[PDB]
């Protein structure tokens, strides 16, 4: 069982103040994100050539570039399970976070795609989430979700022994265009959407209401 609370320890930077000097900085430390993260590196030359294809259907907010479009990409692959650990984790040992460039990009991505619109999303899991009562709930990592119920309660993401959480969110983005599906209607949820009404239903259902957007413990941290 994982713990549902406010993510106090997950790297949650929201970048208020510096996107000009991110998006300046940010081409370097991908680099150096590379050169110590093989996988990432992998995921995301498969991601570009991806994100190649994808690009030409589209037009993109304005200021949205390769490096967003590929970040969002490989998220929506194999390489979204270490980064969600990465960030979760980060407070731990913040000394070996190489999605520095990574989490800026994807960040970034999701606020530039990023409406008022809130939408009613679920999200299934195999692992069940016990709320620890804090008096509000964020999520830290990024969480992947679903405009239908039917695909998060499908055995692909959910099970007896996991969570299914009725989310109501504000700042969740629809990536459909994106994803390797695009079936899963997914919309990603930044981890640092704070939702101040939780409610636990049964074993396995989780309300989360009344989604706000508060500052984070981070803020340009690599800037
Ligand atoms: N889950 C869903 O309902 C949907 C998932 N997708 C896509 O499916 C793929 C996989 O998504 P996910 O299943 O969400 O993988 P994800 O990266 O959220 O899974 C992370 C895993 O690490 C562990 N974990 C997660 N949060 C934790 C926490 N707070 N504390 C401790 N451990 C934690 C659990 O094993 C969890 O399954 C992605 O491409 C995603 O976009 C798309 C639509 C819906």
């Given at each position: 069982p994982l713990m549902l609370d406010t993510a106090p320890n997950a790297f949650d930077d929201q970048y208020e103040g510096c996107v000009n000097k991110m998006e300046e900085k940010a081409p370097l430390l991908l680099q150096e994100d590379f050169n110590m993260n093989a996988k990432l590196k992998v995921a995301w030359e498969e991601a570009k050539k991806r994100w190649n294809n994808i690009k030409p259907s589209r037009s993109y907010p304005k200021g949205f570039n390769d490096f967003h479009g590929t970040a969002l990409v490989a998220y929506t692959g194999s390489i979204a399970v270490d980064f969600n650990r990465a960030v979760r984790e980060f407070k731990e040992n913040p000394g070996q976070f190489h999605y520095k460039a990574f989490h800026y990009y994807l960040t970034r991505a999701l606020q530039l795609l990023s409406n008022g619109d809130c939408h009613s999303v679920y999200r299934g899991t195999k692992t069940r989430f016990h709320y620890t009562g804090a008096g509000s709930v964020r999520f830290g990592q990024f969480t992947s979700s679903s405009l239908s119920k039917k695909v998060a309660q499908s055995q692909e993401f959910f099970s007896d022994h996991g969570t299914l959480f009725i989310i109501k969110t504000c700042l969740g983005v629809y990536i459909k265009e994106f994803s390797?599906?695009?079936?899963?209607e997914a919309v990603l949820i930044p981890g640092y959407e704070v939702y101040q009404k939780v409610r636990t239903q049964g074993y396995n259902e989780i309300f989360l209401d009344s989604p706000k957007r508060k500052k984070s413990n981070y803020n340009c941290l690599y800037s």
């Open positions: 390797f599906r695009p079936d899963q």
